[PDB]
């Protein structure tokens, strides 16, 4: 409907796939080269389907900051026969406060969904089902089961992916350049 929205779905419509674990269906944000994101508690194993193709995984790291605190980011690797276009120069590179924010969800429950989420606060620590979790993104929309790995984006940054929510509000993981450093 404007230029979020248009970022936004030129997001979606290169950089992202259907990931189904044990755990569910999941928006997937792929990054560069095979690489990937999903949240941490999709516990993504030895294969993964990626839109409903049995894919054996490479590698996947469960990202911890220095404190050895969760981060609720799990990178994976593909044994995909394709790329992803390169968007690492769309991350921020430090921690920060946002305006005008759109969360974009891709699955078989919610295809092309796209929810204006307005002002995004730099929230920091949050206890997300239990785990202390570090760099979290807040946001005050009703966000709902079905939207975890959904895409944060404003005009010309890629911020976070969808972690959780407390029925009121809604929480992101940071996406930060220094995570894809290859």
Known sequence: MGPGFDFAQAIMKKNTVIARTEKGEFTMLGVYD???????????????????????????????????????????????????????HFLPRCEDDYNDAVLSVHTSKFPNMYIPVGQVTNYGFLNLGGTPT???????????????????????????????????????AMLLHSYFTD
Do not use: W
């Open 134 to 172: 570090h760099r979290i993104l807040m946001y005050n929309f009703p966000t709902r089961a079905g939207q975890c790995g959904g895409v944060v984006t404003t005009t010309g940054k890629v911020i976070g992916i969808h972690v959780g929510g407390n029925g009121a509000q809604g929480f992101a």
């Open 34 to 88: 095979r690489v990937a994101v999903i949240p941490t508690h999709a516990s993504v194993g030895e294969i993964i389907y990626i839109n409903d193709v049995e894919t054996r995984v490479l590698d996947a790291c469960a990202l911890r900051d220095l404190t050895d605190t969760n981060l609720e980011i799990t990178i994976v690797k593909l044994d995909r026969n394709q790329k992803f276009r390169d968007i690492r």
